């Protein structure tokens, strides 16, 4: 009932994946589709004219915030932009506080990128508008566990079936230890019937607190059990039966056509990005990379979570 | 009579708090309060589309800079920005007079804000096009100047009536010396039926040219005496029968160094308790940021209205913007 | 409408991209929005659009140039500034920026010092891109708004008649003016005749004047008259209808424009300069009629738009 959430969804903060629900997590994916299909046969996307923005990236962070603007402003909103910029020189004197309550009166949102932890919960408690996290030094960036979830459920929908017989495997690739981009989706997955298998070198493995909200999470579904996690340190175990490949960001782990070469038909590569040597470039004529469709993916759910939290009368829904 | 003096303020340049007379206050006052509604009332507010502006920052001023772009966006207008950058970086050895020529050609308006004193004088003869001086370093500002004086109105209206029974006190405490904010306002001020007490540490008083333009400006209009201008050096006398309560920012830069910097940070700061022997009426105000001046606790305590203050610079420059830009005789 | 349909979605890098019937388009549309502009009317031909900027090096005058063009159109853009190759990039290959960003957007302005950067770019992105300045000195727009002002005060360089001949002086740094190759190149394609005017070792290229040498050929107007060199302005500034002063950087003076060193030019004759000035042109100049740097400059913003609107529209014409 998109009316029953968007009234829910309406002036709420998105910091962590864990404040989006079951009900908002599906009209965030439905909103999602709407615009990819609006946006892809060139019809007019502005859902959301009439607000003015403040994003503020206070560190270098040009791929995130090129994207929340470009959906801004394909929603027919404006924004002004603190970019370029760090937590001292932004705050020269000012408490966080004061900064954001001063920030709040001038606009309808604010999209906050801060490497500080502190900063961002000070900010919404100090905001009197709402703020999108979109990324912090605690791995919180629900954007990025919202579009790497839109791209997996667009390639298997029936994760959302929550059926004991349709169960989706993914392998998680690289540095799992500092990868906040893996304990998040791990987080969002973990509600679903899911299976992981964590590859890695021992010294940037899991870390225990991650798997510990996998195993509460699969056993508040019924879905744990010894083959709901497995731990390999080598591509040809750990990339078996698995529907998604994820590799993570920065030698003992780069993806080639030859190591492709026992997956499933249908497995597809994600990859947050930017790469270095983890995918070699002969992987993306590959039909199972999609990488760069999942960065794509970014520009339609950050316009589905704008429309959803800052639509004010919302009548004319997306078609 | 708001389109008499619309008509007269299309496409004024607004560099000083002195090319605002009487009438276009009143204008700016009576217009700044119909954005406040209108905002606070969550109605459209694109009253100026079509506009396309420049904003060249050429110090770091992020808080006047955003308060200029938001207002210009809640127009229904867009901008260029120029930012994060320095007069030499931006200009890189061309004259300010060739630069403006050109980018007066591009926009419908400019607002500037740049340290030098003369590179302003020079854009306003060079612009084809009209500026909003957003600050310089001469210590013009005159849409905060416009934003105090809103503010001040909004709590007690008589200062526009020029009643020689109805006066207006006001305590300016902190640095007086470097407080350009004081002086702007001051001269502002001065203009109606208002006392001042200046509250300083002796180093920082108020500049004696500051005293004379207010000494001169009151006895223009009948209002001068000699409990006009009153000095304290403490919070217990200087906050005594005042309406408003104006405390300055201490800025580390404007000292020799940080020694002397210290030993006037904390010469005034205000609380709970320094608020006891205040009228009921009183009104803390603040430029912003804040360092201590004024304790947290104060945030809780109705007299405060320094976020208000902050808030209504949205009002104020969306409504200059507005008289200045507009093609058109409306509301 | 039979241009602007082959336009659509081109990328523009070179001046050599643009030919004959696209020259046309570009400085009939550039006129409709000087008119449309002058007259205070509506300009929003190109609405709905989201462009990104990308300026790796400070280029401030053409950045904004081309920010206005987009919002008078009615479009939005966003911008990536005060960064420098290294730093944009961090370690990421050109090819996998721009495949991406080119998802966002509907075309990207780059100026970038890097020559290979921009190849790389529309070798990479989805998009149409609009070349805003490289180092190879490729900076088509400059070219196509130096060429509007002329035309405006000498429209018989698209006659390609044999009688109506324009003569132009070229002063300066012509070594590195990669302004003046780039118009030399466009010039050439009519019936036009070059004064190059310098010191020594900053004379044109060689490579240069076999570009005009062979355009000049192409089209039956090369003689030994088409191209001359001079060391001083008295003969330099001779019997041409264009005067134009370039920049000297002093990382890489002998001719100064005054009212006194154009006493013996024609009547006709006018003065351009792609911008800044030092000493090259005295401000006593300025109030001399035959000086047009400044409207060079305004005009920037019409042939901008016209770009803008000839490749991104996908839609009435722009009317006065
Ligand atoms: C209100 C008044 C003080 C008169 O004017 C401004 O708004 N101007 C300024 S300058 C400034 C500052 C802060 C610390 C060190 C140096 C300069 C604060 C702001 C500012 O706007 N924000 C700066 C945020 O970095």
Redo the contacts between chains.
């Keep these: 009932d998109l009316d029953k959430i968007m009234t829910k969804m309406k002036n709420k903060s998105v910091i962590n994946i864990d404040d989006v629900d079951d009900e908002e997590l599906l009209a965030i994916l439905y909103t999602s589709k709407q615009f990819e299909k609006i946006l892809k046969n060139?019809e007019?996307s502005?859902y959301l004219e009439?607000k003015?923005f403040?994003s503020v990236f206070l560190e270098?962070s040009?791929?995130t915030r090129?994207?929340f603007?470009?959906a801004i402003?394909?929603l027919g909103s404006?924004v002004?932009?603190?970019?370029?910029?760090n937590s001292t020189?932004?705050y020269?004197?000012?408490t966080v506080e004061?900064?954001f309550?001063?920030?709040s009166?001038?606009?309808d949102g604010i999209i906050y990128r801060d490497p500080s932890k502190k900063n961002v919960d000070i900010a919404v408690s100090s905001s009197s508008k709402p703020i999108i996290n979109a990324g912090n030094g605690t791995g919180e960036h629900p954007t990025q566990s919202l579009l790497d979830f839109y791209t997996i459920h667009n390639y298997f929908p029936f994760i959302l079936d929550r059926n004991i017989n349709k169960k989706l495997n993914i392998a998680f690739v690289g540095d799992l230890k500092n990868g906040r981009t893996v304990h998040s989706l791990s987080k969002l997955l973990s509600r679903y019937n899911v299976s992981f298998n964590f590859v890695s070198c021992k010294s940037l493995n899991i870390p225990k607190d991650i798997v510990n909200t996998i195993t509460y999470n699969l056993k508040k579904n019924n879905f744990y059990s010894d083959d709901s996690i497995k731990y390999f340190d080598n591509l040809e175990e750990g990339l078996e039966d698995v529907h998604i490949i994820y590799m993570t960001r920065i030698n003992a782990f780069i993806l080639s056509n030859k190591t492709l070469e026992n997956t499933r038909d249908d497995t597809k590569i994600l990859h947050p990005?930017?790469?270095?040597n983890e995918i070699k470039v002969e992987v993306d004529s590959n039909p199972k990379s999609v990488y760069?469709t999942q960065?794509?993916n970014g520009?339609y759910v950050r316009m589905a979570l704008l429309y959803l939290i800052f639509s004010?009368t919302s009548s004319s829904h997306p078609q």
């Design positions: 060139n007019d502005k009439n003015v403040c270098p040009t791929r090129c994207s603007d470009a402003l394909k404006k002004l932009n603190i970019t370029d910029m020189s932004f020269k004197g000012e004061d900064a309550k001063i920030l009166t001038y606009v990005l930017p790469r270095v760069f960065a794509e520009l004010s």
